[PDB]
RNA sequence: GCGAAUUCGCUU
RNA sequence: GCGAAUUCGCUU
């Protein structure tokens, strides 16, 4: 049968007020980056009014708009699209129930005009960090080189712990006044370099690199109402753990960059809410 | 989120 | 299993 293609339009209509920005984040309008998500279906999606999702950056207005229809796709491309759909929900979001309509897929411009991002999907499948921690070989003669532009829109993972299910972080800041030789926040160790050497037996090949501020990527599943009522003892403990996660300062050399950009990840976490709303 | 200890509520 | 309180461990 022929295909329908919809764009999931996203616009930050009400940026988070200062008084609610408890984790003191930068705000990231989705409309500031062209790569986004769409839906490929064999059946038309009924017209649905615009509706909000409440993200870390504030209230985002969602609109489902027709981009293309009455076209065919080869089996090969449908298979690629299907794999990426499954990848989004199993490996990025780590879900089992995508909607808490048939295929979510990345779209991007070719020139201001949106179409299926086949190249991006291919790049993901080729990436050595698509599933887990990628192999590396930093030595004195082939040292780690810090490229600032590679961290400007990055999701990172520690390469040295949690092999089976790595923790993903947004890079929230680059601390150019810090190096691995800066003082360590805990007194049992003098420097970041010493900490990583003692606990993990990790050597660093680059002692001039900046250090990174991070923001955990984990998000609640239903974003259809605002986050903010009192908390239980469990929720407190959870909040405290997230707080400590976000106080961590990481060393770029000891992290791997995920192939999905931070700007797209921020849009991905909205998908379950959007699919839930559409099937209602 | 992954775990632990102690204590209390829901069933007849 | 559905909940609550108090306390401790894992990250930098």
């Amino acid at each position: 049968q022929p295909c329908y293609l919809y764009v999931i339009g996203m616009v930050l209509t009400t940026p988070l007020p200062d008084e609610l920005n408890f984790r003191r984040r930068k705000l990231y309008p989705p409309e500031d980056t062209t790569r986004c998500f769409g839906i490929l279906t064999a059946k038309p999606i009924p017209q649905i009014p615009h509706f909000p999702v409440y993200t870390r950056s504030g209230e985002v207005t969602i609109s489902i708009e027709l981009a293309a229809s009455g076209f065919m796709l080869s089996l090969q491309m449908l298979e690629l699209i299907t794999r990426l759909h499954q990848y989004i929900f199993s490996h990025i979001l780590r879900l089992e129930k995508p909607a808490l309509a048939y295929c979510v897929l990345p779209l991007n411009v070719v020139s201001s005009t949106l179409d299926i991002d086949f190249k991006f999907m291919e790049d993901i499948e080729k990436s050595e960090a698509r599933i887990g921690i990628p192999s590396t070989k930093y030595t004195k003669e082939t040292p780690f080189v810090f490229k600032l532009e590679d961290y400007q829109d990055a999701v990172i993972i520690p390469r040295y712990r949690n092999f089976d299910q790595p923790h993903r972080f947004y890079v929230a800041d680059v601390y150019t006044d810090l190096t691995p030789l800066s003082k360590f926040p805990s007194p049992e160790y003098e420097t970041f370099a010493e900490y990583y050497k003692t606990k993990y037996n990790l050597d660093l090949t680059n002692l001039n690199q900046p250090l990174l501020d991070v923001d955990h990527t984990s998000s609640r599943l239903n974003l259809l109402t605002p986050r903010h009522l009192p908390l239980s003892s469990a929720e407190k403990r959870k909040a405290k753990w997230e707080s400590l996660q976000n106080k961590q300062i990481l060393v770029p050399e000891l992290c791997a960059i995920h192939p999905i950009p931070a700007s797209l990840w921020r849009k991905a976490v909205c998908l379950p809410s959007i699919l839930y709303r559409l099937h209602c």
Side-chain angles (χ1 to χ4, degrees), chain A residues 89-110 113-139 141-212 214-223:
Chain A
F89 294 100
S90 72
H91 285 93
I92 301 181
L93 302 180
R94 289 171 176 166
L95 295 187
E96 51 288 299
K97 277 172 285 185
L100 305 180
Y102 282 145
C103 269
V104 184
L105 74 180
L107 306 178
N108 202 1
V109 298
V110 190
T113 113
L114 238 29
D115 189 38
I116 301 172
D117 200 345
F118 287 110
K119 180 188 178 171
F120 183 71
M121 291 189 281
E122 276 159 16
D123 296 346
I124 297 309
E125 295 204 320
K126 294 173 182 176
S127 171
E128 298 183 359
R130 62 175 312 266
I131 296 299
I133 302 166
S135 186
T136 70
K137 222 67 174 292
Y138 301 134
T139 69
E141 53 270 347
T142 56
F144 169 75
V145 178
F146 178 84
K147 299 293 188 182
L148 181 59
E149 85 168 26
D150 290 343
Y151 301 89
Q152 294 303 302
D153 186 25
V155 170
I156 57 172
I157 66 170
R159 298 194 292 98
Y160 51 89
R161 50 175 177 101
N162 303 111
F163 173 97
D164 291 320
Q165 273 203 113
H167 291 294
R168 278 76 67 97
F169 297 93
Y170 299 115
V171 178
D173 214 337
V174 183
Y175 297 131
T176 59
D177 286 325
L178 296 180
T179 75
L181 297 181
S182 302
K183 183 168 63 167
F184 197 70
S186 300
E188 295 88 3
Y189 315 88
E190 286 289 314
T191 64
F192 288 86
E194 187 198 316
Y195 173 74
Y196 288 105
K197 178 56 163 173
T198 299
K199 190 182 290 207
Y200 298 104
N201 207 15
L202 293 165
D203 306 314
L204 294 171
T205 62
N206 185 331
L207 291 176
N208 302 136
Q209 66 192 286
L211 302 189
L212 304 171
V214 300
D215 185 12
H216 71 101
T217 61
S218 82
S219 151
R220 66 200 169 110
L221 256 32
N222 189 310
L223 302 179

Side-chain angles (χ1 to χ4, degrees), chain A residues 18-37:
Chain A
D18 291 339
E19 57 273 21
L20 298 178
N21 192 4
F22 302 115
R23 296 246 178 252
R24 295 296 143 205
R25 298 179 163 118
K26 249 106 163 183
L27 309 184
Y28 298 97
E31 67 269 24
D32 281 9
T33 54
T34 56
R35 190 175 290 111
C36 63
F37 287 106

Side-chain angles (χ1 to χ4, degrees), chain A residues 219-228 230-236 238-251:
Chain A
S219 151
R220 66 200 169 110
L221 256 32
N222 189 310
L223 302 179
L224 296 167
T225 54
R227 197 180 225 289
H228 305 275
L231 285 70
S232 63
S233 182
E235 295 166 302
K236 277 187 176 92
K238 162 91 161 165
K240 184 182 296 196
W241 175 72
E242 295 180 333
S243 271
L244 263 173
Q245 278 199 304
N246 275 21
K247 285 178 93 283
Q248 290 180 118
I249 293 171
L250 304 187
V251 181

